[PDB]
Design a protein around this nucleic acid. Sequence first.
RNA 1: CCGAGCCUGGUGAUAGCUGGUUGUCCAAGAUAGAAUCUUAGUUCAACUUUAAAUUUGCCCACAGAACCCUCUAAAUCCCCUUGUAAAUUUAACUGUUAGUCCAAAGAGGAACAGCUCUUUGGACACUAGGAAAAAACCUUGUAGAGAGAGUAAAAAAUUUAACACCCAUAGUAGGCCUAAAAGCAGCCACCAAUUAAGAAAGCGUUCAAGCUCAACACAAAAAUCCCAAACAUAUA
RNA 2: GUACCGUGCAAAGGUAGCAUAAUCACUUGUUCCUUAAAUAGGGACCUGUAUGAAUGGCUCCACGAGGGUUCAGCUG
RNA 3: ACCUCGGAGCAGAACCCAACCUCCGAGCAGUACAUGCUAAGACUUCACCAGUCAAAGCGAACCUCAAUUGAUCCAAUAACUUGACCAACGGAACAAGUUACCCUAGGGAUAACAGCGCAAUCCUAUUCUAGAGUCCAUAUCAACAAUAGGGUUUACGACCUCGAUGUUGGAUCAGGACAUCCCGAUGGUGCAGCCGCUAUUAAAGGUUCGUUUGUUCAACGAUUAAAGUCCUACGUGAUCUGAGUUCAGACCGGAGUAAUCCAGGUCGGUUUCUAUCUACUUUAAUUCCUCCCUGUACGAAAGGACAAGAGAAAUAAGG
Lengths: 109, 120, 205, 422
Amino acid sequence: KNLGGKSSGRRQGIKKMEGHYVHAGNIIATQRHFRWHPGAHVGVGKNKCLYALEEGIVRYTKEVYVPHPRNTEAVDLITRLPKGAVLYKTFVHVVPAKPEGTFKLVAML
Amino acid sequence: KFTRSRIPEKVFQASPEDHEKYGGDPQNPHKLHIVTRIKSTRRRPYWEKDIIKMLGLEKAHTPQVHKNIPSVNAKLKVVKHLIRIKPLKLPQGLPAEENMSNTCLKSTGELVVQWHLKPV
Amino acid sequence: KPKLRFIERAPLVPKVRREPKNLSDIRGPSTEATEFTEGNFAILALGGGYLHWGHFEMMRLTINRSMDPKNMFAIWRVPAPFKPITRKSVGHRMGGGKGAIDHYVTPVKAGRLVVEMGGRCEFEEVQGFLDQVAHKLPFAAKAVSRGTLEKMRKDQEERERNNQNPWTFERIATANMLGIRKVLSPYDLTHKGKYWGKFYMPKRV
Amino acid sequence: GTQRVCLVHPDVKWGPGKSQMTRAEWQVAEATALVHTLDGWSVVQTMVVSTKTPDRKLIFGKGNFEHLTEKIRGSPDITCVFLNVERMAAPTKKELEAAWGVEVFDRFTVVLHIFRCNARTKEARLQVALAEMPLHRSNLKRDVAHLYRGVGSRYIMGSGESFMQLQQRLLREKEAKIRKALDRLRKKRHLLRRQRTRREFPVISVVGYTNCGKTTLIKALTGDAAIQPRDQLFATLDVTAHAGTLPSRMTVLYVDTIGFLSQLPHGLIESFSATLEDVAHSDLILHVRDVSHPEAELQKCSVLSTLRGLQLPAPLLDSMVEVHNKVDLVPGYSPTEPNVVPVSALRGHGLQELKAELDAAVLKATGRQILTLRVRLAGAQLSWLYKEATVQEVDVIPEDGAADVRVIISNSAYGKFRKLFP
RNA sequence: CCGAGCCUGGUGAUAGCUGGUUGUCCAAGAUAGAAUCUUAGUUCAACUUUAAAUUUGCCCACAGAACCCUCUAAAUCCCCUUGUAAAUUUAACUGUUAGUCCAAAGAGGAACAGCUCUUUGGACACUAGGAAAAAACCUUGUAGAGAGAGUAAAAAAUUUAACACCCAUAGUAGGCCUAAAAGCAGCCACCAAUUAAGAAAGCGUUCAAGCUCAACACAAAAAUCCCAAACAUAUA
RNA sequence: GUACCGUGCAAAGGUAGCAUAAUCACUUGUUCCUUAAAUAGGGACCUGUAUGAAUGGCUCCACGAGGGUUCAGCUG
RNA sequence: ACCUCGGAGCAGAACCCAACCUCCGAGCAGUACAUGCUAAGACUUCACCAGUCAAAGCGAACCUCAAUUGAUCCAAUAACUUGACCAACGGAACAAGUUACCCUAGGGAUAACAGCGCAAUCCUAUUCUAGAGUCCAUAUCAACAAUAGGGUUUACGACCUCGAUGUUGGAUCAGGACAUCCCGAUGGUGCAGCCGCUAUUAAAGGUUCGUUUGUUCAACGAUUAAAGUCCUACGUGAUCUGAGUUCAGACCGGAGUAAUCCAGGUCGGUUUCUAUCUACUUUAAUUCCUCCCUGUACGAAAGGACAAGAGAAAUAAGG
Ligand SMILES: Nc1nc2c(ncn2[C@@H]2O[C@H](COP(=O)(O)OP(=O)(O)OP(=O)(O)O)[C@@H](O)[C@H]2O)c(=O)[nH]1
Ligand SMILES: Nc1nc2c(ncn2[C@@H]2O[C@H](COP(=O)(O)OP(=O)(O)OP(=O)(O)O)[C@@H](O)[C@H]2O)c(=O)[nH]1
Ligand SMILES: [Mg+2]
Ligand SMILES: [Mg+2]
Ligand SMILES: [Mg+2]
Ligand SMILES: [Mg+2]
Ligand SMILES: [Mg+2]
Ligand SMILES: [Mg+2]
Ligand SMILES: [Mg+2]
Ligand SMILES: [Mg+2]
Ligand SMILES: [Mg+2]
Ligand SMILES: [Mg+2]
Ligand SMILES: [Mg+2]
Ligand SMILES: [Mg+2]
Ligand SMILES: [Mg+2]
Ligand SMILES: [Mg+2]
Ligand SMILES: [Mg+2]
Ligand SMILES: [Mg+2]
Ligand SMILES: [Mg+2]
Ligand SMILES: [Mg+2]
Ligand SMILES: [Mg+2]
Ligand SMILES: [Mg+2]
Ligand SMILES: [Mg+2]
Ligand SMILES: [Mg+2]
Ligand SMILES: [Mg+2]
Ligand SMILES: [Mg+2]
């Protein structure tokens, strides 16, 4: 009577924990829902996977959640929240390590 | 499921009664442990086997000297049910290069630096 | 309505989804209905087990017949059977899917009160039939007053305080001395050796 | 278990089975009462269907059978079907079950199921097990199909008996064990009867159709309170004796009995003979008649046939005192046959007349003599007469220090008295 | 010796199936799964072996890894130090991919199975000692000789049921109910006298009568034949 | 609807005959004879919705190392 | 019944986890036509195949959805591209039945008998004091239940045995248990006596012959003191029989187009073994009945005893 349910595990979750050096483009975490939200220098794919937009150190923090004003469901949640309440979410940041570049003496004209 | 055991911290907080019983002052703690494997690693988890090998306690009843520092203590906490830990005592102080060849570890845990094998 | 209320065989809205036999609901100390409420006497469960509609009927009939309605009142401290137990057809080989829902039970954990009685009466007037019911219950049970329950709890505390044994199950299990956690269960770190399956050892300290 | 049932009543219109005493509406009402008694489910739908030929693998002619198949399979609420027939053969049951995609029950199975559900005493459980043995033997095919597992004639080892045949053997031994147990039960009940028989308690067995108010009448006569009549059918499922006094200050044991239904296999009721033999060992039989019920005559026929099958002594069959209960429901009822007492147990209307009539019947049937006897006071004869016979009036002769006592005394007690106090 | 003869030949047919597979010695060596006309097999992975290159491998401090869900576990991941000496990569391969019990979290079954199915760990498929004999429980493992020595685990404990003695008048057969129901068939009331006694808690009387009481006072049983012998007292 | 009176459908609605059969099960069918006692045998049945007519049906003359039953005798 | 894919529990917290386990769903739809081209770095359903995300850049503007699918070859096409509920979903390009006429290789990796584990089922004993027993729980029972025990049933498990552990009944001989059917002793009884019921103790001895039926059983007939319940590989086929069942032949009913088949019936149908080893091969009796007691005790009658005594037998053992 019970058919299906044979799907395998998605192997989703965190691929880079805090303190891990991460190069640009590396996938930090794969998730089905928004468990960890994108922080600074962390981009979201179509499938909610978080990838490092810069080369640096991954840091997980708890930050206040301010949804985009056009995100109707989140805006309604906020509109129903009691005064003084603040939502928090776990964000993943990539603290860039290297500088954008250096000025080098190329020619002594 | 059987898993690695997290020993609560309060277990390793000695009391004045323990100090009186075992003869160790909380101030001025001993520097080195003498550790002897008194239990087989067989029928114990692979992690305990590996910790024993790390500590170099493969042979039973063979004393080994270890630092009394937090990391070594963590390993000893992991494998504490297989070993006997005693404080290394140095009645004549640390052996010197001159007497390095005349030392002996008496069963009391004292590293005597003169071993004459003669009656007192 | 002092007399004990009737308990239905199964919930009016029968459950449709078969669910596993999570024996943890019987295992361990009871965390609910552990204290008296609007009553002075009760049946305390000194062990875990499942109560069927047959047990409920036994309790109801015995207590209703033996009580004095004008001076005593009784009240259930355990919900009506809700957990569905499924049985396969007799002589069926293993496999082929989970069996159909056969009966409904209500779990009971050690230390819980099954029925609670009160009114213008003392213990001796009630302890008789309460002990009858407790003895006929599927788990170890005892007719206990508020005073007797407090006395037994205080006696357990006194034994725990004054035991001369340097070694306690709690200490050894928590410290993992001798590596006995290889032989113990994670539940034992909280049961402290007083519980073994559905059985509660009261003399155990 | 919570099984909505569709009632199917085959109405026989010609030839055998064309009942001349009952109507399809009344039979449907009785079947509905049976299922309501069984409790937990109800008649979702009812269908009375004509049947010129009632004996077939498919009880109905092909056309009506297909019509019923369409209706039953198009009605999804139906969970089971109750066919108002005495007994249906295994072929008919299998074919109807396959055609209608439901479970089929006949009156035999319904009565059996209510017995199994509301049987409390171990004696009742054993007797209903005996009554079930026929249903078992009929249903082994379906019951042990899954155990059979489609294996036959290929295994060459073990007891040569096939799966079906060795199941028949096991059921034979099971029935033998049940019959032995009922024989032991009969012996034990004889032990129980011994004492009351020795004390010569007049015993009146109250029999009749089911839900005639037998239990209510016994309650009214005895004055008891623990006796609980029920609206359901087959309420009284155990034979018990209750003491009640008559106007002559005589104690009599009313024996309550199982109810009787029409159109049932005889073996069903006859399996309770182990406990219904108390009627055979009775002194009078009181037949209760729910005259209000439209099927009173059919119920009469059914109960008389059931007693004849139970093999009660012919002298006991004769002298059966008939009481017409539920007269209040039939206002202005006028009894027609003689030696019939109209009574209303709930309202307790004719109970005094019934008590007097059955007192006279007991005097006639128990060999008891109402006579005046002269005894000497202080000689313990008066106390002995009180204890061993029912005294009715004590007229004391002070001059002689004696007394004339009007006593209803049995011959045994009279002989004991004449010998003890010459 | 015919479900299709016999002989020869193709023919050393083919067989994922069974059986067999012969000198000495040492060493490493039991390990997730996937697909498969596939679950009696095989290919890949994993594990294992060998050789080679290189540098980090294991243990692991904080900090860190989600709401749903009100609470909600043993833990895990990550991880510098530290104790350690292994690890990754390259090259070439086979063999194992038909598994048992024990502890623990569970699921199915019937909170049966020496049952079945996952997960964490152990042991066994290897040595030795113990639990009687003993794969899986406990002790212990790296190998030889010794007519030395200290130890490890390691021997079951229980024997259970006594309980008063004396005394009882009485408003009255309290009312009602009933033929009678007087403490005692049922309902209402349940006061009250004596120093002290229920308008009666049990027997009993058809009803009474009479007997007390509350009161004054002073664990086990099955089928060949039980199954070491025995022992309570000489210093841990 | 009350066997006969009409009716739907079909190619035709199983006719004669026999019938618990060597004939699914119910089955040891119900009865009478047979026996002290019969799940056997023989005779019958509103007996087959799974009998039935050259996939031959019923009847009975002889025959049979066929399968049942049986009187009397015979005998280890 | 299922076979592929996804979500949620089992699997509470990195990942991963089985089940003919519990539940839900999918084999699309909608919008857009930059759902264009390129390219770092990463994830990866534990392999591979496949599947995912994506910075920067060019070119422009200023995808939703959990699943929503399928390789190669090969066909169609000028090309771009398209093609299978290949759903047995890693997919043979295209092939069903039946075999008891059967065969070979294996399997105790896997069933039937037996053993064994377990005790759901079955059986037994106590506790409970509701209810039967006129009153009265406990003379005899006993509901709801509780606690124990047994290993006779049907199972369930698949642990030994498939390079054979021969199978149901019957004959023969029986060994054992006692939870005793009879005989012995005793307590209770709703034990007046006779029959009885119940319990403790007792396993030395005994525990019938027949009609159908292959039957173990059951029914019936006649008896008996009784015609006990079980275990022993459902004791015992190298002691026996084969009536049933269970090969090859054939008929009836039914299924199928047929081969052939049936939880059906029915007639017939090969019972091997010279004993090597172990073991073994000469170890005070019960019961019924007759008379008398005695028509006594008992009892209202009906009926009707013990004990003591006498005599007879039957079986069993030995001659
Ligand atoms: N005697 C009687 N019963 C009535 C009357 N009206 C209704 N009844 C119902 O008749 C039913 C009789 O129930 P019982 O006396 O238990 O029935 P019974 O005759 O003993 O039969 P079983 O129920 O089989 O035991 C009750 O449900 C009464 O309520 C009436 O006038 N007289
Ligand atoms: N990819 C693909 N290949 C196909 C498809 N249909 C057929 N083929 C090819 O053709 C094979 C099947 O051959 P058939 O079954 O005869 O195909 P068909 O179309 O039914 O018939 P024909 O045209 O007569 O061959 C496949 O294995 C492919 O090689 C299809 O839908 N998709
Ligand atoms: Mg899943
Ligand atoms: Mg009644
Ligand atoms: Mg030849
Ligand atoms: Mg070859
Ligand atoms: Mg080696
Ligand atoms: Mg060594
Ligand atoms: Mg007194
Ligand atoms: Mg014969
Ligand atoms: Mg991968
Ligand atoms: Mg596939
Ligand atoms: Mg054949
Ligand atoms: Mg072969
Ligand atoms: Mg078996
Ligand atoms: Mg096996
Ligand atoms: Mg297995
Ligand atoms: Mg052999
Ligand atoms: Mg005995
Ligand atoms: Mg057997
Ligand atoms: Mg034969
Ligand atoms: Mg044919
Ligand atoms: Mg034959
Ligand atoms: Mg022949
Ligand atoms: Mg032979
Ligand atoms: Mg011989």
